[PDB]
Design a protein around this ligand. Sequence first.
Ligand SMILES: *[C@@H]1O[C@H](CO)[C@@H](O[C@@H]2O[C@H](CO)[C@@H](O[C@@H]3O[C@H](CO)[C@@H](O)[C@H](O)[C@@H]3O)[C@H](O)[C@H]2NC(C)=O)[C@H](O)[C@H]1NC(C)=O
Ligand SMILES: *[C@@H]1O[C@H](CO)[C@@H](O[C@@H]2O[C@H](CO)[C@@H](O)[C@H](O)[C@H]2NC(C)=O)[C@H](O)[C@H]1NC(C)=O
Ligand SMILES: *[C@@H]1O[C@H](CO)[C@@H](O[C@@H]2O[C@H](CO)[C@@H](O)[C@H](O)[C@H]2NC(C)=O)[C@H](O)[C@H]1NC(C)=O
Ligand SMILES: *[C@@H]1O[C@H](CO)[C@@H](O[C@@H]2O[C@H](CO)[C@@H](O)[C@H](O)[C@H]2NC(C)=O)[C@H](O)[C@H]1NC(C)=O
Ligand SMILES: *[C@@H]1O[C@H](CO)[C@@H](O)[C@H](O)[C@H]1NC(C)=O
Lengths: 483, 480, 104, 103
Amino acid sequence: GVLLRGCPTHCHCEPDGRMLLRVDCSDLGLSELPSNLSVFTSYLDLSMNNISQLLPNPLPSLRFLEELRLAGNALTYIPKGAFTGLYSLKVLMLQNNQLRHVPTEALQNLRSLQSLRLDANHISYVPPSCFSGLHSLRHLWLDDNALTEIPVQAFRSLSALQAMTLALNKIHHIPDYAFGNLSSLVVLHLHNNRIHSLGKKCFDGLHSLETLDLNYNNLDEFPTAIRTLSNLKELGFHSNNIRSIPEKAFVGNPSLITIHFYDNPIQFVGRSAFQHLPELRTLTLNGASQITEFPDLTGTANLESLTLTGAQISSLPQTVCNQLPNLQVLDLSYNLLEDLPSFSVCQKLQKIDLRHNEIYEIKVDTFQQLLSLRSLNLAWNKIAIIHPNAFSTLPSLIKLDLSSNLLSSFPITGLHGLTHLKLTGNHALQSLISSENFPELKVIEMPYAYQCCAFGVCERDLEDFLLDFEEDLKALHSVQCSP
Amino acid sequence: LRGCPTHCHCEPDGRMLLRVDCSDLGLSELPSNLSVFTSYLDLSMNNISQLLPNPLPSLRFLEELRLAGNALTYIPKGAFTGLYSLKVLMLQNNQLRHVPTEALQNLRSLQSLRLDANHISYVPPSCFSGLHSLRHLWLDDNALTEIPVQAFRSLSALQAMTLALNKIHHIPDYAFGNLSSLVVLHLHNNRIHSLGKKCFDGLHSLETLDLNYNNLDEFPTAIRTLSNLKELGFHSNNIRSIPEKAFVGNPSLITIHFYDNPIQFVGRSAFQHLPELRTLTLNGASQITEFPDLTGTANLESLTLTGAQISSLPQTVCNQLPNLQVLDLSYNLLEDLPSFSVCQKLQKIDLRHNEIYEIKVDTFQQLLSLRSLNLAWNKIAIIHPNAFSTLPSLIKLDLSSNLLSSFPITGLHGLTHLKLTGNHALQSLISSENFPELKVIEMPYAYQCCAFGVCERDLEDFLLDFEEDLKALHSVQCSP
Amino acid sequence: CAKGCELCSEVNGCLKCSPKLFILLERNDIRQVGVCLPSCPPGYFDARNPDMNKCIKCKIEHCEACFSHNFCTKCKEGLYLHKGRCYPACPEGSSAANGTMECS
Amino acid sequence: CAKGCELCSEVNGCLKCSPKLFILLERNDIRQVGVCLPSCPPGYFDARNPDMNKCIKCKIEHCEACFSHNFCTKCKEGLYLHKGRCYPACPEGSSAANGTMEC
Ligand SMILES: *[C@@H]1O[C@H](CO)[C@@H](O[C@@H]2O[C@H](CO)[C@@H](O[C@@H]3O[C@H](CO)[C@@H](O)[C@H](O)[C@@H]3O)[C@H](O)[C@H]2NC(C)=O)[C@H](O)[C@H]1NC(C)=O
Ligand SMILES: *[C@@H]1O[C@H](CO)[C@@H](O[C@@H]2O[C@H](CO)[C@@H](O)[C@H](O)[C@H]2NC(C)=O)[C@H](O)[C@H]1NC(C)=O
Ligand SMILES: *[C@@H]1O[C@H](CO)[C@@H](O[C@@H]2O[C@H](CO)[C@@H](O)[C@H](O)[C@H]2NC(C)=O)[C@H](O)[C@H]1NC(C)=O
Ligand SMILES: *[C@@H]1O[C@H](CO)[C@@H](O[C@@H]2O[C@H](CO)[C@@H](O)[C@H](O)[C@H]2NC(C)=O)[C@H](O)[C@H]1NC(C)=O
Ligand SMILES: *[C@@H]1O[C@H](CO)[C@@H](O)[C@H](O)[C@H]1NC(C)=O
């Protein structure tokens, strides 16, 4: 040995870079780790491997060891001199062990360590100055543990950290300046905890934070500390118990791109709450009954998808579409809308859903110049009259739903050759509709069957599999019509 | 054939009785000569300006006269004198501006009279005088403004009348007083805005009432006196609410139509005591806060009540609801649920968009006829493991948009539709096994759909040989 | 288009009739053709509406001609007519038949 | 059934993994196959959840290994890594760059 050592018995070795060795001794059911172990090792995998105690017979001098994996072992503790000779250690993996605390001194002064995995353990205590002397540490996993409180003291030295996970723990409170010194931190995961109360200055530390995950938690109020994270881009606090989004909630966080707050019992949202988020692309608000006014979206014109349902919106501003260019899908279903704005300024609109509103009439300009619009749903309204030219300028329109709207007649100008047409619930609609001036219709809903009767009722390899599936759907589909 | 007029077409009725068809022949005046024994005379679409200065009575065997589309402006007094056997007279699509003042009088055998599609606006009193056999009267598509109460006072033998498509705006008390024999009354497509409290007190034998397509602002309480009423229609009006004890005077009601009405509220006991009623639909009655009482009306087969503010159901709701097949209480504010076990014969249940937080054990036990169960868009955090243990006929299950993380799978094997989207905490895998016969699936994550397999020449031989297997692999849908 | 018709299609026949006439649709082929009549043929009854006048099949047991649905105008022979419907035997009172077959 | 596995099918392989292991789903011939691992292979990242631990592909441009989505742990050679993302040139510089390719 001492230079000429072979591949450890029962293990599997393989060359890395020239004169460097990768040793795989995973799932061999070792009681203790390999004995006569070789220098030139740059990768050591001992995983799922019944190691009760790492050694009485230490193996330093592996100064070329880049990566140590010690997962699925039965380690209850880590001795102080365990990782002494490992000067080139970049990544250490210690997940799925029975560790009850971060090694008090064993992890100290590993100069080159960049990523540390201590997840899936039983750790409940994180001794201060256990991470002391880790200048290269960028990534820290501490999830699926039994933590109760943020180790603010232990975290105070890791000013080079970029990514941290404290998920799947039992953390209930976040004190002020809990992550004070973590200035380089970019990604913080606190999801699946028991966080009920957090301080007002609890996030004041991390200036470079871009994503914050407070999902699957127990928040009763919107976390206002959020206001201090200027560089924040992604925000998650869904599946909590938050009741409302306050006015000026994301004021401190422009350049936000995604926000997740679903599975929250949200009833009210401030009007100016979603102002000044120009990088935001999608806004979804379902079942916020206490909303009585359409939200203001000044300085956030890059919305592509706006859906807001189950509220009490009585009317839309005349110049509502002035705030919404680039908008593709609009869904104001289940509201109390009577009059409709122009919607012409809202080009690039592809889909519109206004069902279950109190709309009594469709004007001329209310749908003019929507050349990209494909789907229009106005079902379950009280639309007595439609202007003849209302749908004159919608070439790309293919789906139209006018179900249950007490209509008697119908505008046929334009609208020729669409794909879906739904007219059930309009009892006063008894006249006939031709197969001509209506080709390409494939799905039809009709108030009366005799109207349905008028429509004839009574190179690459193996991608051909895919072509077969595309061709299966169409052409096997004949014209449908339900009365 | 002499007897049959030239250019006309005749055919035997009873032996040696004649039916004469002289319709669209463009006659200026009605046929010359023509034979007695005629029991049917059809002169329709035929430019008859005046029935004649030389009329042809003596046709005492004439059973049926048709005179439609002939453009008659008036009918002379002695026009139908000799016609002793006339049972049905058809005078539709003419330009009559008033019912013949005397011409229709004393036609003793007349049973059915058609005066629709005219311009008649005035109905002179005692114009129907001496019509004792008249059972059916048509007066639709006309220019009437008011119920001819006086003229109607002699027709005590009428059984069916239509005053539809007119311009009637008001119905006075006792407007149809002497019409005790009337069974069917059609007043649809009018301008009826106000009707008296005792406006229907006359007809004791009325079974159907049509007030559809009208302009009513209030529920017609005059209805209360029609004991024998069976069918009631007042849809497409502007009625805002159905009052308490609205159909109190009308048991043995079978169908009621009140859709296209801006109905916001309905009294609790409003639908009590209608044992012959089979279906009740109530959509968008926001002001309803309580489930309706249905005492003495246990023959409901379909109950749908949506868009209200119902907070809770009585424990013993199903005690009032045997024979019930379909239940739809979607878009309400329901939190706790009753047993529903007493509600046997239940085939379909729809409870979407409610505030339901939990599904207990007995809440769906022993519903052996149940086929479709929709609980989408609720806040259902937890389901008891045995909740669906006793649902053999269950084939469609919707649990979309809930707060579920896991799933009770005991029983429930081999249903047809399964919908689980919106359940973000539902991340575990679901096998193709313990789930055969599935044809439509909705899934919170794509990798769960993939678990159900939705992820030159001689490749065509491949497609053709392995055809039924491929089509068997495309017999399952899955949206992620 | 055709006699007494204003809007027709060669395939479906007449789609709209002159102002006060009735549309008849059959539906006996498996194909639907529309005819325009001054009044509906036997088996059907006339129903007028502000938009479309239509001939409606009278689905009443043992009914030859009817005033609307639920009310029969003349019952089949060998069957008595009482209050717009037909029985072999008359329900109550008179309910007594004369030389004629119409329970008074 | 399989290594570190509790529920398997001949068609789809492992359907549920041991308590603390990660499931990896990869498509073999119109079929999906699940493996149970102590940690995720290159290209994937480890995501733990109270119900299922899963290996998730990190679709980040020019990223070899990642901490989650939107954050890269090791960038491809010839491309600089700055704050969990990959650029051809580092905006601030200064802190970039030594002999290594890690701003
Ligand atoms: C997985 O790891 C555990 C713990 O490291 C192993 O359990 C150990 O099993 C051996 C024999 O199977 C036990 O040996 C015993 O030693 C005592 C002296 O202490 C002796 O008096 C007994 O007669 C017996 O030989 C050992 O005690 C036990 N360890 C503990 C902590 O209980 C287990 O064997 C490993 N499994 C595999 C498959 O390697
Ligand atoms: C708090 O953050 C500061 C700034 O990153 C850290 O300051 C460094 O402190 C160490 C001593 O542990 C010195 O060797 C470095 O030279 C300091 N860097 C500076 C001043 O830029 C500090 O370690 C963190 N933790 C504390 C103060 O507890
Ligand atoms: C149908 O009958 C009317 C009368 O009811 C005829 O009316 C005549 O119309 C011409 C002009 O077309 C007038 O000059 C005559 O004075 C009208 N005569 C009468 C008696 O009113 C009409 O010509 C007839 N049309 C057809 C096609 O038979
Ligand atoms: C109201 O209707 C009743 C029938 O219910 C009429 O009573 C009959 O009237 C006729 C007159 O044509 C008499 O010949 C009969 O003797 C009356 N009784 C019967 C038939 O039982 C009554 O006249 C009608 N009243 C009015 C004002 O028209
Ligand atoms: C390791 O190698 C030395 C020879 O240098 C030998 O004496 C010793 O027994 C070996 N140990 C094992 C466990 O193979």
